[PDB]
Amino acid sequence: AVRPTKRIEFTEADGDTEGKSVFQLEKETDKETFKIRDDNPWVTVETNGAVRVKKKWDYEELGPEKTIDFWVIITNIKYTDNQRVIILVKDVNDEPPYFINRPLPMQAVVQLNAPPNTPVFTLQARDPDTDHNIHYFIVRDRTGGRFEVDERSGVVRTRGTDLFQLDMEYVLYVKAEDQNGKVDDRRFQSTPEERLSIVGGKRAPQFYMPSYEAEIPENQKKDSDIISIKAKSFADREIRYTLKAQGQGAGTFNIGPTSGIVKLAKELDFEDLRQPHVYSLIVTATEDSGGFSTSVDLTIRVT
C-alpha cells in the first residue's frame, strides 16, 4: 500500500552539508522503520524516517526535472507500506565561470600599424548558474597599455597610435567574474587567470588541443577513422596536415593532409611483439601558403 507522496522545496544550498538532516517522514506507528528502496547519491534515509544530505546537493548535476525523487519502504498488524518522496531543488549562484574560447591558450596577432580601438580578440566565458552576470577583466597588463578589454562584450582592442613590432609578444592576463556570485563581501566567483598571447604581424598556426590522445582496442578495423585533428591559421591560410612516428610504428598510421583525420593503416596484433602498446606520433600543420609550421603530440594506446 502507498502513503501520500512527500513533496518539499529547498535550495541546493540547504543541502550544502553532508549528513545534515533536512526533514523527517511521518510515522504512522512508532515501531516503524524506514528503508530507502534504492541507494540514492543525494540523500540517506535513517531508520526513524529522517532524511539527510549524502553528497552535497548540486542543482547543476540534477536531471531535467531538478528533483531528488525516491521511494521509501516502511516496515512494521504486520505491513510493508511504500512512500515516494520528491525534493524540488532550487538553483543558487554557486558555480564559477569558465572560458569557452578555443583553442587554448588564447592567441592572436596584431597588425603592425593597427589604428586605435582595433578589435583583436574576444574573451568568451560561460557560467553554469541560471542567474549569472559575467564581467571581463585584464588583471596583468605586460604590454604598457597597448590593449584594453570591454567589461561586458569581452572584446579586446588596441590603444594608442604607436606601431606594433613584428614577432613581438604582447601578453595580457585575463579573467571573467560572475558578479552575481560572491565568495566574500569583497570578491566574486572567477575563471582561472588565462594568458592571452598577442603577436605582432603574424604567427604560426595553433592546434585546437595542446596534445592529442586516443585509445583503441587491438581489434580496430584497418582503414577505420581513429581521431580528428584540427589546427587554426591566424591569417586563414590553407593548412596541410602531416604525421610521423617518434619511435616504433612508422606506417602504422596516416593522416588525411586536408581532413586532418587519422586512420589505422595496418592490422593490430598483440601477439606481434614488434608492435608497441603505445604509439608516439607527431602531427604537423603546415601553412602551405608559404612557410609557417606547427607540431603536436599524438599518443595512441591500444587495449
List contacts with Ca ion (CB under 5 A): 58-60, 91, 93-95, 127, 129, 178, 181, 189
Phi, psi at residue 13, to the nearest 5°?
-75, -25
> Residue with CB nearest Ca ion?
178
Closer by beta carbon to Ca ion, 103 or else 128:
128
Minimum distance of Ca ion from residue 64's CB (angstroms):
15
Cα–Cα distance for residue pair 43/126, rounded to 1 Å: 30
Closer by beta carbon to Ca ion, 60 or else 218:
60
Minimum distance of Ca ion from residue 161's CB (angstroms):
39
Cα–Cα distance for residue pair 94/183, rounded to 1 Å: 9
Task: Please give the C-alpha separations between residue 144 and each of 158, 169, 171, 172, 175, in angstroms, as whole numbers.
Answer: 11, 12, 10, 10, 18
Cα–Cα distance for residue pair 180/185, rounded to 1 Å: 12
Minimum distance of Ca ion from residue 70's CB (angstroms):
20
Angle at 78 between CA 74 and CA 82, to 5 degrees: 25
Closer by beta carbon to Ca ion, 131 or else 213:
131
Closer by beta carbon to Ca ion, 93 or else 206:
93
Minimum distance of Ca ion from residue 58's CB (angstroms):
4
Cα–Cα distance for residue pair 89/10, rounded to 1 Å: 5
Amino acid at the residue 225: D
Beta pairing partners, 294: 285
Minimum distance of Ca ion from residue 95's CB (angstroms):
5
Minimum distance of Ca ion from residue 96's CB (angstroms):
6
Distance between first and last Cα of the chain: 51
Closer by beta carbon to Ca ion, 58 or else 81:
58
Closer by beta carbon to Ca ion, 38 or else 185:
185
Minimum distance of Ca ion from residue 174's CB (angstroms):
18
Closer by beta carbon to Ca ion, 70 or else 188:
188
- How many CA atoms, within 13 angstroms, populate the side-chain half-sphere of residue 211? 8
CB burial readout 267-303, b (16+ within 10 A) else e: ebeeeeeebeeebebebbbbbeeeebebebebebebe
